[PDB]
Amino acid sequence: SPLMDFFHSVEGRNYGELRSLTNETYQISENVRCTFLSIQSDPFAPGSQVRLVCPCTFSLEKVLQTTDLAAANPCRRVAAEDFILRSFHAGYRNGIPRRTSGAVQVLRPSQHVLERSTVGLVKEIEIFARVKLPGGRRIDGHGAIDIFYNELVPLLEQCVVGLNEEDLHQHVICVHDQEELRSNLLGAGYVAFVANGAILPRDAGNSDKPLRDNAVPFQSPKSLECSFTLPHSGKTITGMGLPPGLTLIAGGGFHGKSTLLRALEVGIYNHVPDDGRTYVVVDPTAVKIRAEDRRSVHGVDISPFINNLPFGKTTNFFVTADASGSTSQAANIMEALELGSQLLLLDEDTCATNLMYRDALMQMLVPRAQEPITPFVERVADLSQNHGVSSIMVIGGSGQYFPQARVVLVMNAYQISDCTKEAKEIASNSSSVFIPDVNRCFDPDGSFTTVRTKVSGIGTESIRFSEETIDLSMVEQIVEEGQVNAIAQCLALLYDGEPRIVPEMTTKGGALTQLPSPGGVCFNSNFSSMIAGCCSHQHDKRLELRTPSCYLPRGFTSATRHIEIGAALNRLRTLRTVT
Amino acid sequence: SPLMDFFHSVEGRNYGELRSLTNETYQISENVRCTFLSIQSDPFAPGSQVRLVCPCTFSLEKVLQTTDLAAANPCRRVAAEDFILRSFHAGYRNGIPRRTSGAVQVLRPSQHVLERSTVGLVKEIEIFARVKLPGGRRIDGHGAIDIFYNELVPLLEQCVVGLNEEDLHQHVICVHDQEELRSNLLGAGYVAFVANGAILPRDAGNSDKPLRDNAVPFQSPKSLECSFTLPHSGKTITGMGLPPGLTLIAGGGFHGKSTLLRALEVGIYNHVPDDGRTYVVVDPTAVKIRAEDRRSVHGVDISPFINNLPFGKTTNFFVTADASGSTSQAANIMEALELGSQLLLLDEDTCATNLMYRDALMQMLVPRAQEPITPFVERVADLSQNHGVSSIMVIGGSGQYFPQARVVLVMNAYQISDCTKEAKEIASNSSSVFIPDVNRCFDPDGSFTTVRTKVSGIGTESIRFSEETIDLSMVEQIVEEGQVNAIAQCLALLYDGEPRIVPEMTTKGGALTQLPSPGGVCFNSNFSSMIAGCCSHQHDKRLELRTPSCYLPRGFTSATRHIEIGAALNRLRTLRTVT
């Protein structure tokens, strides 16, 4: 009642009158209370931060297993929080609100189940939102009363207090078994697993939802079939297990190779049970590797792939403002290695192919003396045998990886086939360099000298760091705005505590054995250890970092790997590195 | 005086009081008058549209050649307007304004000289801007008086009335000789020309300015050297002329191949005289061709490259919501052909390489029966001999195009070399399908049925069409926001006059012999003829189209080819096509 009474008594008064709200709590329903955290300056501006809280109506026993929240599996807690968020949003599609304003901004999840600051299960369910308070320049009492009483209150009462305890419990189970399966891949002796009956294709070019119509379910070649009995559902699933080493994915155009590789890329994530890619997992450290022309690089050793540059330019400590296709990809590989990646994913179409192979005709035209590039084909075995680093590759034009392949697959009309033997036969009927101990200090002094601040995430595509744009359009395993919001935050903290935080983070990271994953479960350099500290700390700090440089509201952050954090900083154009 | 007096007498009064401005003209200086066109609703909103006018202080005789503006060469008029705009902006860097607010928004040009609605030479110089009128919710009289009196007035008086008549005249000459050279390429028997002494490289990965330091000037191989005496400067320049047919650009990594191809891509444009790429020209219809995964296609015949798709899917009238690498590239090629392109530019790194070639080992694994893709290598000669369509290609991995090549170039440390003979030798020491008469009606009925409007350009990267995002991030010859603003406008007009405009445009386009180029100088289907009408009309209408669906201010539009207009519509996901 009170809040409505309030919005009544201010119905016409001046907008600044709203400031009285700040920090206050209002029962707008029996089950729904509403704290204001912040109040907007004008109606035009970014809305007031709000926190809404309602209670567990489901049983911590059935759903979380443990009696009290602290003792619960963080993976189930995260999956639950991901369910509640989805329910909330679905509530709009089912027209639950008596009135729909569009003044509410709550983070929208992806197909993936991530830890986010948006929905919290506390010791009691809290949701963080921005509400654009209605108001010509005086308060709209009734505009606002609708938002809270006839949009939010019912929404929460219904799709949240009123959530389906059974639906939730099955959501948590599916998410948990996915995590089980991925975190058992290594032990079981695999590098990837594609579950039979999976629906790999998406519904459109700009969709991440499964194909509705005529999707051809994935079926494992009989020779690669694996089984895993999931602990929580108790169900036993079969699929294709890929062993350590080099896997080739071959086949004609439009036969699904890239569609399969994509599912693999995002196999470091758990999905919504009906995503179609559930139980399609890969090594948690898997990195999509691609050419990235024109990107900048600082202090990366790519001499395993590139030597003898024009004018004797160092590849041992490579530094450009304008990468080519081959040196950007080699830089990506070497940065992936430093950040901990044990599995490389490649797709011929986005590869700098001159990096990949060179036929004999070409070597005649352009002899190795004229050619800085050492092909990947001559290094892939080095990486795998000496360093435990596997590769999966979609290939078209060339078959000269057949010899190195441990698995060669052929795709015909979306069907997978094991053609390893035939591959090897064709190979006969025809015709360490890496060092785990990388040398790199991030140089905060050099990197930050031009900073005039503001650090903000821009969609999924970039970070605005002062007068600098960090381009993430080709860091392709970034999946949610919240992740970018996450990256933009250590950056701001990395900068705001400029002197003490870098040595702190770098020391922190050297110590660690386990890094937190995006689903919440918990080769070296100064740089990577720092990065490993960048977000060990951010995860302890529960994903949000209040610093003078950060202007992000509460509840718009999503977990990301340390690999992606390092990904962003590697691509900062002011970046300076040292020894 | 008056306007200041005005902004004084309203200094504290309510913001709505500003509406009195609208449509009024104010002499804020002897040489500078200022019409308001529009006034913002609130201070927060997008600013008031303003038009400022000052006079020719330079001589139409020396600069434009003709006595009166109407009779002047549109290319010189456009170049002049491009100079004045640049001068205006430079005025900020040289701190000309006594006060710099940041409330002024004028379109910023690129390195390229384009026709724009921003600066107009009329029969008298007019500039179109948005000014964010300062104002808590009441007018800022002094905030505003600064903007006009101490920022704009001096700016225009100084870098515009006070422009360097000699600098301008040399700008116009350079631009005109560039246009002369490109529009004489065909006649002279070439397809591209790279002027000796050109500075191809850019200064950074995210810059379009020439490299400052240690740039290695382009030098033509002696065997390809051409000369052209420019009519207006009277200067004679030399460089590399590329003949019709297939040119290969080969060479090691980091040797400048992509840097050269890029200069070629944008060689359909005129640049600022000190750009470094001036007199680096190609066929005006040149199109960069690349893979574009996941894009949508409707009604394109790609059967020259793709046949036998899974489940008997038509390639004769190809239609997906999710293109693969090979079918999107083939679709790009076929769309380019339909839109009139006589010159194809390709770069191995962004190619779907399985489209490009397949080695023998691969054909053993995956026989043609399993392979929908017919390689480009088997079609390039068809295109060139039968249809006059040339190709220039950066290639790395494979040398199987050597046989078809008419010119093979090798790049070593940024030096170009003619290795055609040696290429051919290696080729020996080893080992029509297109139909000009394309069948396609745009179907306005099918395409527009989901439109709930608003059409707006988003940077250089996309168009927002109702609840649809047209993705242009890989239409790579788009160079200015204004071009996107241009495309977004026929779309809105195409839609707003839904019934009568499509048959009108399509008829208009069938009639035409000459299409206007971005610098202002003036294979078939229903679709392309429509497109050729889309912007014959937009150019007559002087680039701006007032329709209920368009909310773009005056003076933020830039010319684009019809090819790019068609480029955008081909990529609309609701697009429906017919016969």
Ligand SMILES: Nc1ncnc2c1ncn2[C@@H]1O[C@H](COP(=O)(O)OP(=O)(O)O)[C@@H](O)[C@H]1O
């Ligand atoms: N298993 C599948 N079932 C149904 N459709 C699929 C399947 N895999 C891919 N597709 C669809 O067919 C198209 C071709 O797939 P893609 O993997 O891109 O081919 P390529 O082998 O060239 O990578 C895609 O646009 C996708 O939407």
Ligand SMILES: Nc1ncnc2c1ncn2[C@@H]1O[C@H](COP(=O)(O)OP(=O)(O)O)[C@@H](O)[C@H]1O
């Ligand atoms: N003529 C030149 N003079 C000086 N630097 C150049 C020149 N051409 C290219 N570069 C620089 O060297 C790098 C390699 O050029 P690029 O064309 O990308 O190599 P690639 O042959 O692999 O395409 C680019 O980042 C560019 O900035």
Ligand SMILES: [Hg+2]
């Ligand atoms: Hg709640």
Ligand SMILES: [Hg+2]
């Ligand atoms: Hg877990």
Ligand SMILES: [Hg+2]
């Ligand atoms: Hg499941």
Ligand SMILES: [Hg+2]
């Ligand atoms: Hg398995």
Ligand SMILES: [Hg+2]
């Ligand atoms: Hg590859």
Ligand SMILES: [Hg+2]
């Ligand atoms: Hg086989």
Ligand SMILES: [Hg+2]
């Ligand atoms: Hg983290």
Ligand SMILES: [Hg+2]
């Ligand atoms: Hg923050």
Ligand SMILES: [Hg+2]
């Ligand atoms: Hg002027």
Ligand SMILES: [Hg+2]
């Ligand atoms: Hg001209």
Ligand SMILES: [Hg+2]
């Ligand atoms: Hg010039």
Ligand SMILES: [Hg+2]
């Ligand atoms: Hg020439």
Ligand SMILES: [Hg+2]
């Ligand atoms: Hg190519």
Ligand SMILES: [Hg+2]
């Ligand atoms: Hg040569």
